[PDB]
């Protein structure tokens, strides 16, 4: 059966991901901007940044910001969620990780962006409950074989300069969200290594590979998740087992962004060499995926 | 290898599902209750009270539509988490179908399936104007893959009788909304139809233009009929592909479910035995490890101990 290579370009916003991956047998599943702005709701991006502003300015409550914020995170990852679901059937097993794949699918972000990272970063900003965050983790789709996630690398001061340009419609420069999101993505990369090096959160919770204190597990030592004796409630501990399961099988690659669009584009091409591809499940899988990838781009990509 | 029998008793509230599920277990078998404690303390505060009050404010014209959807969506997310984590934690243990075939080593009886929190209630609330169709479709797209041996028992009770029942059985925060009762009832009716329409070979894409245990129902008698919303329609007249792809997920999730109907218009003991009768002809599954049994047993017993009642 033909082989496919899936590549999910992810990381904090304002790094140059999209603006260097478009540059990059090869299909590009762009950002669902039309779905965020119109199809699922109107100006979701604007709504997100405005609520954090009213929150920050004391015009609304933590609880107000939280319901508005949770609701919107559902809108943000909808296209990512259906795409996975419709795609999942065609993904076969690892391809003796071989000749060039029949198709390379470049995604502008992975389902965990809206299901884990942004929700985690907003909890870190005081606008989302760790319980809501864990609800989204619990809803992360199973990790199919060949899930290659490229995360971005760029110094802060430089990310601020880019961010100053990658201003989405409705977006407001919030260096705190920029720091909350950078940290979240940082912990994300540490979590994968932790899990892949054989770390057990249950065994390390009472506080070579990263320290549990440097993985995403640190965020869930939140007072809301703990019983009167400091015990993590089981529902939550089960949501953490699922986070461990989902993340350990992912393949993570770092693309340094502190270089030229060419260089970034050039680097992404090199990383390609160690990504895990897979076989499709049917003869028509490739053609169907392509049309899927083109139909998504036309409709929701702006 | 040891087999397992999972049964989710679902359907509208105010019918007697929880009582009979209990009874059934009072006759091994383990009970996975409604995460009441999660809905009112662990996940958030008084979520059921929050749900019924928001619709109310909506109805009173005190809150706008958008205000309510924002609250409903969030509330519905809290309502389903225990169901969703339990399902994701169970999954690695579920093996292939066995059948019924002799008695199972373990029988799990669930109070509602994940699709209640991720589909039925949201669809009923959309229908009540308290949530958006895109949001419902967003939940649908997130319904977990249907494990084999998914036996769903949906309840039936005459409308008048259901109404009088509701007029008693007090849930904290729940305020008697009969419009919501009918909505939830119709949603569950469409659900049953949908599973079947799907099993009789129905194709929503082939039948879109038209908008066993019985003949194939009409697409307009299935859940697909709710998604004929102008919000989800492209200027050309058809659904945008995002929503169309979500409906493909719905058909895929409900196609492998084994739905059964239980009559609630009888005594609690009757419902128990009527249910204990449906059970026999229900699909079983092996577990993936022998120790899946003890594992599964404790998860259920732990869930109940921490979230039930
Ligand atoms: O789940 C998400 N939540 C969120 O708030 N965003 C913001 C980041 C950026 O400003 C713009 C483009 O990424 O959208 C993105 C995602 I995916
Ligand atoms: O997703 C859900 N949404 C909802 O509104 N409910 C209501 C029904 C009943 O009032 C009470 C107990 O079931 O909670 C239940 C679920 I599961």
């Amino acid at each position: 059966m033909p082989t496919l290579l899936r590549v999910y370009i992810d990381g904090p916003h304002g790094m140059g991901k999209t603006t260097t991956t478009q540059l990059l047998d090869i299909v590009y599943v762009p950002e669902p901007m039309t779905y965020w702005r119109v199809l699922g709701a109107s100006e979701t991006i604007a709504n997100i940044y405005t609520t954090q502003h009213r929150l920050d300015q004391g015009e609304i409550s933590a609880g107000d910001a939280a319901v508005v914020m949770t609701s919107a995170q559902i809108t943000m990852g909808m296209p990512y969620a259906v795409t996975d679901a419709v795609l999942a059937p065609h993904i076969g097993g690892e391809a003796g990780s071989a000749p060039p794949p029949a198709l390379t699918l470049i995604f502008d972000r992975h389902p965990i962006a809206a299901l884990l990272c942004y929700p985690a970063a907003r909890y870190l900003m005081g606008s989302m409950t760790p319980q809501a965050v864990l609800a989204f983790v619990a809803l992360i789709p199973p990790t199919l074989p060949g899930t290659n996630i490229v995360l971005g690398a760029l110094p802060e001061d430089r990310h601020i300069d880019r961010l100053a340009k990658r201003q989405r419609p409705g977006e407001r420069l919030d260096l705190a969200m920029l720091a909350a999101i950078r940290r979240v993505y940082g912990l994300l990369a540490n979590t994968v290594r932790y899990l892949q090096c054989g770390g057990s959160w249950r065994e390390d919770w009472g506080q070579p590979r990263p320290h549990i204190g440097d993985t995403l597990f640190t965020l869930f030592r939140a007072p809301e998740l703990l019983a009167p004796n400091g015990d993590l409630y089981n529902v939550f501990a089960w949501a953490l087992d699922v986070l461990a399961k989902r993340l350990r099988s992912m393949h993570v690659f770092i693309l340094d962004y502190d270089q030229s669009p060419a260089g970034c584009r050039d680097a992404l091409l090199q990383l390609t060499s160690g990504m895990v591809q897979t076989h499709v499940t049917t003869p028509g899988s490739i053609p169907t995926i392509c049309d899927l990838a083109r139909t998504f781009a036309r409709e929701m990509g702006e």
Side-chain angles (χ1 to χ4, degrees), chain A residues 2-302:
Chain A
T3 47
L4 171 86
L5 191 252
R6 279 182 294 144
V7 188
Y8 299 81
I9 312 312
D10 225 324
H13 48 115
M15 276 187 311
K17 294 154 41 287
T18 81
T19 338
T20 74
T21 187
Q22 298 160 326
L23 271 189
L24 230 290
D25 66 317
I26 315 183
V27 184
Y28 183 60
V29 176
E31 225 169 38
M33 188 53 84
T34 304
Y35 190 85
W36 295 337
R37 280 230 236 174
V38 192
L39 323 182
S42 62
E43 308 299 337
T44 314
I45 291 190
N47 176 47
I48 291 184
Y49 283 94
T50 296
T51 303
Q52 185 75 76
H53 187 77
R54 303 197 296 218
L55 204 228
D56 288 351
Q57 302 289 286
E59 295 161 29
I60 59 182
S61 65
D64 283 341
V67 302
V68 169
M69 221 52 105
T70 302
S71 184
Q73 280 302 326
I74 294 294
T75 314
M76 301 295 285
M78 198 283 180
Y80 292 132
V82 273
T83 293
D84 187 76
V86 173
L87 203 79
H90 303 197
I91 304 302
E94 290 197 0
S97 326
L103 190 67
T104 298
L105 247 184
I106 304 269
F107 286 91
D108 195 311
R109 291 185 141 134
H110 181 273
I112 61 172
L115 285 157
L116 162 74
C117 312
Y118 281 83
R122 287 280 176 207
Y123 150 72
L124 246 25
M125 295 289 296
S127 40
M128 186 160 334
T129 60
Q131 291 97 312
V133 179
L134 253 15
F136 293 127
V137 156
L139 291 174
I140 292 169
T143 311
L144 309 116
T147 306
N148 306 298
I149 298 280
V150 172
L151 294 183
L154 180 70
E156 194 173 49
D157 67 329
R158 254 278 240 168
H159 187 170
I160 296 176
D161 295 320
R162 298 218 155 135
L163 213 204
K165 314 186 188 313
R166 327 312 195 238
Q167 277 302 100
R168 302 316 167 135
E171 192 175 323
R172 302 163 188 253
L173 246 150
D174 185 318
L175 303 182
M177 183 50 207
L178 204 243
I181 201 55
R182 291 185 90 237
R183 161 140 116 116
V184 167
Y185 270 93
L187 296 184
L188 178 68
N190 286 350
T191 314
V192 180
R193 232 133 48 57
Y194 174 74
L195 302 168
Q196 292 186 344
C197 277
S200 173
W201 82 265
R202 273 167 195 272
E203 155 187 65
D204 295 1
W205 189 258
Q207 319 180 43
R209 79 294 273 234
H211 194 267
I212 198 182
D214 310 309
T215 64
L216 287 158
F217 298 111
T218 338
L219 314 174
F220 307 106
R221 175 192 174 46
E224 297 102 317
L225 305 192
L226 311 178
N229 53 232
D231 266 358
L232 231 177
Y233 282 112
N234 285 264
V235 227
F236 300 129
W238 291 331
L240 297 187
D241 301 327
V242 175
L243 176 62
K245 201 188 320 187
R246 304 279 108 106
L247 309 179
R248 74 149 175 216
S249 57
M250 292 185 332
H251 298 111
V252 177
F253 306 84
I254 313 298
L255 170 59
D256 171 42
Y257 276 98
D258 198 318
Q259 61 191 298
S260 56
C264 295
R265 169 183 54 84
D266 279 88
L268 178 71
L269 225 311
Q270 298 299 354
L271 287 183
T272 279
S273 308
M275 306 195 164
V276 187
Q277 52 197 77
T278 63
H279 294 92
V280 293
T281 226
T282 43
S285 284
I286 293 290
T288 298
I289 278 166
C290 240
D291 298 4
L292 176 272
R294 306 192 299 127
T295 297
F296 176 110
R298 74 177 213 216
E299 188 180 274
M300 290 167 273
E302 235 167 38

